[PDB]
């Protein structure tokens, strides 16, 4: 086509979606990880995770307001990944890298799994 | 912070949100423009437009499944802008620039209004 493109548009969209999350505006699901609860937008979860994409395209699960993750999933690892989904920023540290990689493999977030594997290989 | 960042994340998120729109997955509103109907995600509309942000933060309008725009709004201008919201790409042409600028001013999409003003000034 003969379209023009606004370079910062996608980043500005994601920044506003994170502002809505922080104010709990139009969140339509709660993700339960052990005792911890995380509110989010189904569409953003699907856009970032192969696991959520599969869950919310299912004709029955698409209507659930609560999703319980496998009890092996660490709430801190999930929190770091949910923050990444809404910001593009990953808080990867020596003390959390194993829990982050395991959570990203479960959530099917291929690019996060790739950077965790590379950072572990270096050490 | 000490975060790392994935450069293509925001663009990849927006690409997936557009894939959901094209398949009509989790769309929660219909925007009526004269005889024409456009299905979309309320959160994406809010993230891109000052007008939709105001509408869907309103305690009564946040629950509407149908929104009717002012009859002066041109369906083609709206279609071009909805495409921009989901892609960052604007199909700006000599034959549509006046309808696109008027629709962007109504929708309160400041960056689109700015490029339309510049393209009109040049001609």
């Amino acid at each position: 086509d003969s379209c023009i493109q606004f370079t910062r548009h996608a980043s500005d969209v994601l920044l506003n979606l994170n502002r809505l999350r922080s104010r709990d505006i139009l969140t339509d699901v709660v993700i339960v990880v052990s005792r911890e609860q995380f509110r989010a937008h189904k569409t953003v979860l699907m856009a970032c995770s192969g696991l959520f994409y599969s869950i919310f395209t299912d004709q029955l699960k698409c209507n659930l307001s609560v999703i319980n993750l496998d009890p092996e999933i660490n709430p801190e690892g999930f929190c770091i990944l949910l923050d990444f989904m809404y910001t593009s920023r990953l808080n990867l540290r020596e003390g959390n890298i194993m829990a982050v990689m395991a959570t990203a493999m479960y959530l099917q977030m291929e690019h996060v799994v790739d950077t965790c594997r590379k950072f572990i290989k270096a050490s | 912070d000490s975060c790392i960042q994935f450069t293509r994340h925001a663009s990849d998120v927006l690409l997936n949100l557009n894939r959901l729109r094209s398949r009509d997955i989790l769309t929660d509103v219909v925007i009526v423009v004269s005889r024409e109907q456009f299905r979309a995600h309320k959160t994406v509309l809010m993230a891109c437009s000052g007008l939709f942000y105001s509408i869907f933060t309103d305690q009564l309008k946040c629950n509407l499944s149908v929104i009717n725009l002012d009859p002066e709004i041109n369906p083609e201008g709206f279609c071009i802008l909805l495409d921009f919201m989901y892609t960052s790409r604007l199909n700006l042409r000599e034959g549509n620039i006046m309808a696109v600028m008027a629709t962007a001013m109504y929708l309160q999409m400041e960056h689109v209004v700015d490029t339309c003003r510049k393209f009109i000034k040049a001609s």
Binding site: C3, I4, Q5, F6, T7 | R89
Partner: peptide, 4 residues
């Protein structure tokens, strides 16, 4: 704005 750019030519993509």
């Amino acid at each position: 704005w750019v030519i993509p």
